[PDB]
Symmetry: C2
Subunit: 363 residues, 2 copies
C-alpha cells in the first residue's frame, strides 16, 4: 500500500507543488533565483514526500522484481531531483545529503539492482508508465512535455538504429542482407534528425532553461555527488559510435566516458554496451577490404555505410548547437561531437581522413 501511496503522490500532489512553484519563480525578474520565494510550498513538498518515503523504508526491501524496484527508485529520485531544483538540497553547500530517509532508500535500491541511486533518463522517458494517458512528470508545463516526449522518440529511434547495426556482425559487411540493415539504420537515424528538428522548432527556449532544465541538476545521495541524467544515457547512441568506428575504446578519454555513464542506463544496455567495446567495427572492416573496391557489394554497402556515418555526425552537430551552445567539460563535449561527425582535426584522432579515403575509393 505504501509504495502505491508514494506513486499516487508523485503523479498528483507532487506535480501541483512543483508547478505552483515554477509560477512564482517565473514571475520574479531574476527568474533563476530560488532564494526566498516559495518557502511554504517547498516545506510541503519536502515534508509530504519525506513521510511517504519513511513509510516505505520498511517494505522497500521485499524485492518485487527489477521493474518494481527501478520504478520505486524513480519516484524517490524524482522527489530528490525536485528538492535539488528548489535548492531544498544543494551539493557544494552540503557535505552530505540532508534527506536521510530518501538517500538510504535510494542507495539501497540502486546498489541492489545495479543502477545509479538517483533519477535517470529512463525514469521519465522509455520506462515512464502512463495511467490513462498521464505519465510521470515534474510540472504540468507544456514545454516539459515537449522535452520528454521528443527525447523519448529520439531515444527509441537511436535504439532502432543500433539494433540494426548489431545484426550485421554475424552477416559481414559483404552480405546482401547487410545492405537492408544499413538502410534500416539510415531511416532510424533520419527519424532522430526529424524528431530533434521538431523539438527545436516547438520548444520555448526560455521556459525550458528556467522551468525544465533546473530539474536535471546534480545532487548528493549520501555523501557522493551524482550528476544529472542526460539524453545520451542509454546504450543506443554509444553502440552506434563504437560499431561505426567513429569512437575508440582503446583511448582513455572515451573508455572513461563510458565508465561514467554505465550506472545511468539500464542493466541490459550496460551489458550490450560493454560488449561493443571488445568487438570489430564496420569502419575498419571496409578499410581492410580496400582492394575489393570493384566488388558490387563493396560499392553498394560502402555508399550506404558512409551515408549512415555522415547522418550520425549530422545529428551530433545539431544536438550540440541546440542543447549545448544555447544552454570546463565543454571541450570534452566538442571532442565527442567532432568524433561523431568525423570532422578534420589534428589535436585528436578522427575518422575524417579514413572516411574521406573511403569516399574517394568509390570515386
Amino acid at each position: 500500500y505504501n509504495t502505491e501511496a508514494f506513486d499516487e503522490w508523485i503523479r498528483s500532489r507532487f506535480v501541483e507543488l512543483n508547478s505552483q512553484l515554477e509560477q512564482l519563480y517565473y514571475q520574479q525578474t531574476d527568474r533563476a533565483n530560488v532564494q526566498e520565494v516559495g518557502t511554504e510550498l517547498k516545506h510541503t513538498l519536502e515534508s509530504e514526500g519525506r513521510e511517504l518515503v519513511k513509510a516505505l523504508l520498511d517494505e522497500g526491501n521485499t524485492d518485487e522484481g527489477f521493474d518494481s524496484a527501478f520504478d520505486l527508485l524513480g519516484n524517490v529520485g524524482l522527489y530528490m531531483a525536485a528538492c535539488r531544483r528548489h535548492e531544498i538540497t544543494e551539493p557544494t553547500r552540503e557535505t552530505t545529503s540532508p534527506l536521510l530517509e530518501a538517500s538510504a532508500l535510494a542507495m539501497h535500491i540502486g546498489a541492489s539492482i545495479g543502477v545509479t541511486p538517483r533519477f535517470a533518463t529512463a525514469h521519465l522517458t522509455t520506462h515512464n508508465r502512463a495511467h490513462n494517458g498521464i505519465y510521470k512528470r515534474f510540472t504540468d508545463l507544456p514545454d516539459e512535455k515537449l522535452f520528454v516526449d521528443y527525447n523519448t522518440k529520439g531515444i527509441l529511434a537511436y535504439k532502432r538504429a543500433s539494433d540494426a547495426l548489431l545484426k550485421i556482425q554475424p552477416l559481414g559487411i559483404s552480405h546482401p542482407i547487410s545492405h537492408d540493415l544499413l538502410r534500416v539504420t539510415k531511416q532510424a537515424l533520419q527519424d532522430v534528425i526529424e524528431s530533434n528538428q521538431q523539438l527545436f522548432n516547438r520548444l520555448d527556449t526560455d521556459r525550458f532553461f528556467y522551468c525544465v532544465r533546473p530539474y536535471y541538476k546534480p545532487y548528493r545521495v549520501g555523501s557522493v555527488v551524482y550528476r544529472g541524467a542526460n539524453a545520451g544515457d542509454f546504450a543506443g547512441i554509444n553502440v552506434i559510435d563504437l560499431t561505426l568506428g567513429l569512437c575508440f575504446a582503446n583511448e582513455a578519454s572515451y573508455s572513461q566516458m563510458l565508465v561514467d555513464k554505465f550506472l545511468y542506463m539500464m542493466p541490459e544496455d550496460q551489458q550490450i554496451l560493454r560488449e561493443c567495446m571488445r568487438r570489430p567495427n564496420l569502419m575498419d572492416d571496409f578499410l581492410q577490404a580496400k582492394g575489393c573496391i570493384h566488388q558490387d557489394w563493396y560499392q553498394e554497402n560502402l555508399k550506404l555505410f558512409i551515408e549512415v556515418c555522415e547522418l550520425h555526425g549530422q545529428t551530433a552537430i545539431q544536438h550540440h548547437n541546440e542543447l549545448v551552445t544555447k544552454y570546463v567539460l565543454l571541450a570534452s563535449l566538442e571532442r565527442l561531437r567532432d568524433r561523431r561527425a568525423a570532422v578534420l582535426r589534428d589535436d585528436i584522432r578522427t575518422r575524417y581522413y579514413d572516411l574521406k579515403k573511403l569516399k574517394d575509393s568509390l570515386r
Copy 2:
C-alpha cells in the same frame, strides 16, 4: 586449422557436389527420386565431409565462444542435412544415425550451448556469414538464394516488429509514445507482407519443391529424430502472437508448440520468448479499458492496435496458402493460422469476437 578447413569445404566443394547432384535428379522423370542416380557424388560428399569432421572431433571442445560453436554446429548440421536429402541417411529406415562422427560432435556442441543438435534456421539466415558476398548454402541454384534471402528479410522484419511491441510494456497502452511504437510495428509488419509477396512472385514452385525443400527434412542425430528448421524458428513471430494476445500460453496445445521449438532458436530468443509467456498482453489491456472508450488515447491507439492485429493475421493466411497449401499436423498448422488471423472458430478459442467487440467500440 581443422575448423577452418571444414568451413572452406562447406563453402566450396560442398556446394559443387549438391549442385551437380540436383542436376541429375532434376533430369529424371520422377525428379523427387534419389534411389540410383548419383551414387558416386554421394560417396564423395559423405566421405570428404566425414574425414573433415573426424579431424575436428579433437579440437572441437576447446570452447572458442558461443558464436564459433554455433557456427561449427551449423556446418556439421548442413553436412548432415545434405546427407538426409540424398538419402545417404534416413530416419525411419534407420534406428540410429549412420553418421557416427558427425552425430557425436553435433550432440556435443548443441547440448553445450543449449540448441538443437542440427541445422537450424539461423544457420542459413540471420547468422550465415558472407565471405566477399558469398555465404553458406546448399546449392548454387538461384531459387535457393531467393528462399534464403527473403526468409532472412522476413525474419528481420518480424524482429523489428516484436522489438517495438515489447517496448510498450513499460509505457502502457495509454502512453502517447505507444502510438509511435504501434506505428513502427505496423511498418515492420508491412515489410513482411511485401517481402513475402516478392518471394511468392519470383520463386520457381518446381525448383523449390524438388531442389530446395528436400534439404529441410527431418533426420536422426544419434537415435533421436529432429524435424527440419522452419521459417518460424525464432522469437519474433511468437513474441508478437503472445504480446498481441492472439495466442494463449495457458493452453496445452500452444505451450507444447513453443516447447517443441525453443531449441530451434537462439538462446537469446528462447529467453525472450519464455518471458512473454508470463506477461500481460495488449489485447486484454484494451479490453479492461472498455470504459475509456471516449478517451483520445484509447481511440487513437486502439485503431492502430487493431490494424496491427489484422495485419499480422493477413501475413498468416498468405504464408499458409503459399508455403503450406501448395507444398495430419495440418490441423494444428491451421489452428495456429486461425489464432493469428483471429478468424471465427467454434472448435478452438479465438480472439475473433474480442477483436470484433473492440472495433465496434470505435463505432
